[PDB]
Each structure stands twice: as structure tokens, then as C-alpha cells.
Design a protein around this ligand. Sequence first.
Ligand code: HEM
Ligand code: UB9
Length: 402
Amino acid sequence: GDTQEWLATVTVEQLENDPYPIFERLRREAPVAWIPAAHAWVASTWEACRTIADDATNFRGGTSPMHERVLGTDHILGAEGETHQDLRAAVDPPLKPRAFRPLLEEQVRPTVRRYLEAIRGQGKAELMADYFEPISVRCVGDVIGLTDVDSDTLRRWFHALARGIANTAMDAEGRFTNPGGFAPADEAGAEIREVLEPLVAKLSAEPDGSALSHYLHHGRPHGDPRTLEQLLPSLKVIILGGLQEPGHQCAATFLGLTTRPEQLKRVTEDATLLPRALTEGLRWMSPVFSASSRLPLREITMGEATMRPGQTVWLSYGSANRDEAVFDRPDVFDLDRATHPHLAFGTGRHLCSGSAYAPQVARIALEELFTAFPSIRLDPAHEVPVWGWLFRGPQRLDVLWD
Ligand code: HEM
Ligand SMILES: COc1cc(C)cc(OC)c1O
């Protein structure tokens, strides 16, 4: 009763601006809990998240009214069975190491160095807009068919879609209380479709082996390519998270390192520590903090939570990765933390398709930054605003160097 009374007082604003004390209490008191402000359940412990994520018998891939509005109905996150296998066939192969490894030095590092040289000329930087986001959107956009879309547009798109997903304030009846918050996503969606539809039409009839051609034709009979609507919601999943998350991994890892000066110094002197740092960054401030989700396939009870079909169950992998039962002092960033899996890429059949590629983009981005500016530090003139409980990360990351 005490926990339910407290949850009735939690606002979306509190979740966005100060989630850690909320999830700390949930992990202790209610591993799965209904959040009235969001009209949805959230799972907060490692075991609640892992079990719900993996259990393909009692839960299906998640969705929500924001997913449907922003992405479309039949997106890969929500898909199961042959439909999910088919969408994974479309998106997965270009993201495997056998496919992307040559691009790391041919494409990714040159892209990173272009942005590195731009900030070198400034003598300081706001690393989100000036470095991490352009690198992320270019390196990912260039491998998902958006080679001809400029970085400003790609950043605008992911920010708009991510804002739409986060626009989850709902009343007791499940009605949006801020429908105007979808206007950026609605416009981004129209622009995305206007770019992709002519490419899909062309490549459907005359395949060329580019990324979108594979999305249409790989694993399909000749004469039965995927259609625009079969792909578009999933392409929007990738335009949101494929473009946003790598920049957040970089920023989370950078910020975490700044909290441990001796570890930051070690990493600047030895780039081979970056994979370990990046893994700890994902655990310490998981970019997809609670935007993963499942839906129940039957009425199912976990503790006081009796979940029913159609209801969103958000999986706070970011809270799971902060669970005191699994990690010692989980609120601390520790480059040398004892080896253990994390949930920042999820688990099971819906495990992130980008889980091998994203850490390589981030590794190269940080390698170049720390090699060029080993004296880099946070700019004390500007706070580092960290925001979000669905998607979480630094909004701005002003730095100085000597
Ligand atoms: C560090 C960066 C990234 C993080 C932290 C991240 C995290 C996640 C998470 C948590 C999920 C949901 C897993 C679940 O529900 O259990 C997911 C799904 C997915 N991600 Fe990633 N992601 C990242 C980068 C990327 C990139 C770069 C791409 C593609 C270019 C991508 C493509 C996908 C796809 C297609 C799915 C859907 C998989 C499915 O439902 O079967 N992600 N991601
Ligand atoms: C709702 O939106 C998303 C949710 C997740 C878990 C991952 C994504 O991208 C990989 C998304 O776009």
C-alpha cells in the first residue's frame, strides 16, 4: 500500500529529471510496478527485466501508443515469430562484424577525424552537437541507406522521434495529456517517408546491393520483396535508436570517466582500455534506460503486479544495470568493475541488432578524441544536463582542453 500511494505521486517530470531514487525504491519494493503517470508497468530489477525480456511464451515484443504514433504499428520491437525473423533478416546482416569490419578503417575513422579536426579548430567543444552526434548519425546513417541525408537532418529526426516516444504522460484512461508533443515526430516521419519512399520504389524493381536494397530483398523469394510499409516502422526504430544511442554511449562513457580521474588518465594513456570503459558506460548510464518493453500474452502476476494483454511493460534495463543485488556500488562508474553481463542491449530474441557495430563506432570516436586531447575536462562554465528515463543521456557536454 505504501508503495502504491507513493507511485501515485510520481510524475513523468520526476522520472525524466531524477530517475535514480525512484528506481532504487522500486528495486527494493516492487520489481514490477504500475506507474499511473505513464499508464504502464515498469520492471526495475535485473531478474524482473531479464525474465520478462527472455520469456517468449508469456510476453511478446513491446509497443505503446507512442510507438504506434511515432514509429508505426508493426515495428521490429513488437514483432514475433516468422514476422520478427523476417525483419531481423532484413536488418541484421550489415551489422555483423563480417560485413562492417572493413568499414571501420575505410569509413568510420575518416568520419570521426573530420569532426575531430573541426573541434580542434574551436579550441573547446560541445561534444554532443559538435562531435558525438554527427559521428553517430553519419557512421550509422551511412550504413542504413541514408548516405544522402545531411547530419543536421539526421540529428533533427532522431531527436524528434525520441521526443515522441518520451511523450508518455497519460491520464487514468490512457489518453495523452500532451498530444502537441508529437508535432516534431509527425513532421520527421513525413520527411523520412519522403526520402525513403522513392528509394524503396526504385530498389524494389531494380536492386543495386545498397543497404536499402538488402532490406527489401534479402531472405525473400524473387518477386516477393518487402514493401515500404513492411519496413518503415522498423526503419524508424533504427533512425531513432541507431542514430541516438551510439552518441549517448560515447557521452555516458566520457562522463563516467570524468567521475574517476585516475581511470580517465589511464584511458587517455592506453586506448586498449576503451572497450572495457565503453561496456561500463553502458551499464552505468544505459542509453535505452527504460524504452525497451514487452506486452503480456496472458494475464500474469509478478508480486503485486497483475499484468494483462495489451498493457505496456517497460523494461528499465538502466535500473537493472544499477541493481545492488547484481553489482557492488552500481551508482559508481568503475573501469575495473568485475566482469558481469549487462542488459543495455537487452537479451533473448530481441537482443539489439546493433550490439556488435555500436561499440566499434564508439571505440573509434573516443580513441581519436582522447589521443588528440589527453587534457580534456568538463567545462565548469556549463552544467552537464542528463535527462530521461525512457532514453537517457547527456543533452550537452561542454569540454575544455589545454
Ligand atoms: C550503444 C548503442 C545502442 C544501444 C544501447 C541499443 C540498445 C537497444 C535495446 C535495449 C534494444 C531492445 C532490446 C530488448 O527489447 O530486449 C535494441 C533493439 C534494437 N536495436 Fe539497438 N541499441 C544501440 C545501437 C543500435 C544501432 C547502432 C542499431 C542499428 C544500426 C540498432 C538497432 C536495433 C534494432 C534493429 C533493434 C530491434 C531488435 C529486435 O527487436 O529484435 N541499435 N537496441
Ligand atoms: C521505442 O523506440 C525504440 C526502443 C528501443 C528499445 C530501441 C530503439 O532503437 C534501436 C527504438 O527506436
